């Protein structure tokens, strides 16, 4: 803003509607002091706000420990109070390189005497000039007739502590009604046809997203079901949808003649493709017999499943061991 | 006026180990943590300080290496454990809560009772 407001006069506004992006301020780090209590910008993630109260001024640097609640001193109690429950970050920079030039400025006026303690959100404005009861004077400058409020000067000798700066005090408000505002996540790349535990604007589950032809509308956002259970995801970050479906869940089934006649036996997982069964949380056991049957050059789809341990063949046999879909194993031959 | 509830302190003997803890009704996790001891003839002094995370430690450099600092969230408290003790430790033991500065060491927002800490040789 090319002008500012004064030092009792702080301009105050109000932030809604968008979020702070603290991340291209992060790395940049450009303001010289980023004081945030009870808060820091990295836990900030853990945390939503509805709304933001902006509190423009320009302040000394040396008063901003002065200036906070249960301070032990007759000094702070008459310069500025806040409340004790405070949540608000202050965001300072120097601003010496415009704020200063030759020969100083005269623009601070503060104020010595008040007739009591501010009141929080209460509006003082009138023309009127307030004269002492006690010993006014009405036609001289004499005793108990003093300008109501009194210069302040900063000069070069003073330090850089010392010199101005811009502050910004940004307070944001809890209300009752639920968080509306929270700060940007990251967020992972968008991956398909392989299980994955998908978090989308909240909703939370797990299955294989893949493209879909489905045709949403546009304020339409989820997908259902018959069963009321979730089947499709509009992904806020791109407009498609996405289908989602259970990950492999199956069953295991060994299919051997009696163990008189051989050990050779045949794994039948079901309903599943067979590129699935070696990645169906295996790799992790007995190597010499169990990744045999996880993976082979005998491996049939049938409707039912997937077979690994057994040959298809052109001829066609008597049922011997039901394995359904209308076909069957038998070890004769 | 906080309400801040300080453990430990006393009267320790020189040469061993200090336990002191403080807890507040406000969250740990979210707020940094800070010890600072005043003894008579110096100011206040920093002596040690831990972020949000408890990753980031900062101690005076001439009694950095002795002195260890824990957050426990499920209690809500800031426990310190102190080895190889000196008289200097004999002292007035603030625990202060806020938030993490780039620009000073340690933010300060709430200050704690204070305990009384003697060594005796």
């Known amino acids: 803003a090319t002008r500012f407001a004064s030092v009792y006069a702080w301009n105050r506004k109000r932030i809604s509607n968008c979020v702070a992006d603290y991340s291209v301020l992060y790395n940049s780090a450009s303001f010289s002091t980023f004081k945030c209590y009870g808060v820091s910008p990295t836990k900030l993630n853990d945390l939503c706000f509805t709304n933001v109260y902006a509190d423009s001024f320009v302040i000394r640097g040396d008063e901003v420990r002065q200036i906070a609640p249960g301070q032990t001193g007759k000094i702070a109690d008459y310069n500025y109070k806040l409340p004790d429950d405070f949540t608000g970050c202050v965001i300072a920079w120097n601003s010496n390189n415009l704020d200063s030039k030759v020969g100083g400025n005269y623009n601070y006026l503060y104020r010595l005497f008040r007739k009591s303690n501010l009141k929080p959100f209460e509006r003082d404005i009138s023309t009127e000039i307030y004269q002492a009861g006690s010993t006014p004077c009405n036609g001289v400058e004499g005793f108990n007739c003093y300008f109501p409020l009194q210069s302040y000067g900063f000069q070069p000798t003073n330090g850089v502590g010392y010199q101005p700066y811009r502050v910004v005090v940004l307070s944001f408000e809890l209300l009752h009604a639920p968080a509306t505002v929270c700060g940007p996540k990251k967020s992972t790349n968008l991956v398909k046809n392989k299980c994955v535990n998908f978090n989308f604007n909240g909703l939370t589950g797990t299955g294989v997203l893949t493209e879909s032809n489905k045709k949403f509308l546009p304020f339409q956002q989820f997908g259902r079901d018959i069963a009321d259970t979730t089947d499709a995801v509009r992904d806020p970050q791109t407009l498609e949808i996405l289908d989602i479906t259970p990950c492999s869940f199956g069953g295991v089934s060994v299919i051997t003649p009696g163990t008189n006649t051989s050990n050779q036996v045949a794994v039948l997982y079901q309903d599943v493709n067979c590129t699935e069964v070696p990645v169906a949380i295996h790799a992790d056991q007995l190597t010499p017999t169990w990744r045999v049957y996880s993976t082979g050059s005998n491996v049939f789809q049938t409707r039912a499943g997937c077979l690994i341990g057994a040959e298809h063949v052109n001829n066609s046999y008597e049922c011997d061991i039901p394995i359904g879909a209308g076909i069957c194993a038998s070890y004769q031959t | 006026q906080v309400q801040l509830v300080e453990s430990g302190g006393g009267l320790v003997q020189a040469g061993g180990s200090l336990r002191l803890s403080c807890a507040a009704a406000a969250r740990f996790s979210t707020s940094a943590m800070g010890w600072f001891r005043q003894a008579p003839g110096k100011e206040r002094e920093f002596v040690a300080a831990?972020?949000?995370?408890?990753?980031?430690?900062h101690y005076a450099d001439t009694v950095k290496g002795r002195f260890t600092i824990s957050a426990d969230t499920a209690k809500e408290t800031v426990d310190l454990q102190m080895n190889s003790l000196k008289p200097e430790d004999t002292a007035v033991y603030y625990c202060?809560?806020?938030?993490?500065?780039?620009?000073?060491?340690?933010?300060?927002?709430?200050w704690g009772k204070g305990t009384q800490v003697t060594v005796s040789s």
């Open positions: 831990i972020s949000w995370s408890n990753t980031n430690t």
């Open positions: 202060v809560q806020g938030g993490w500065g780039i620009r000073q060491p340690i933010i300060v927002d709430y």
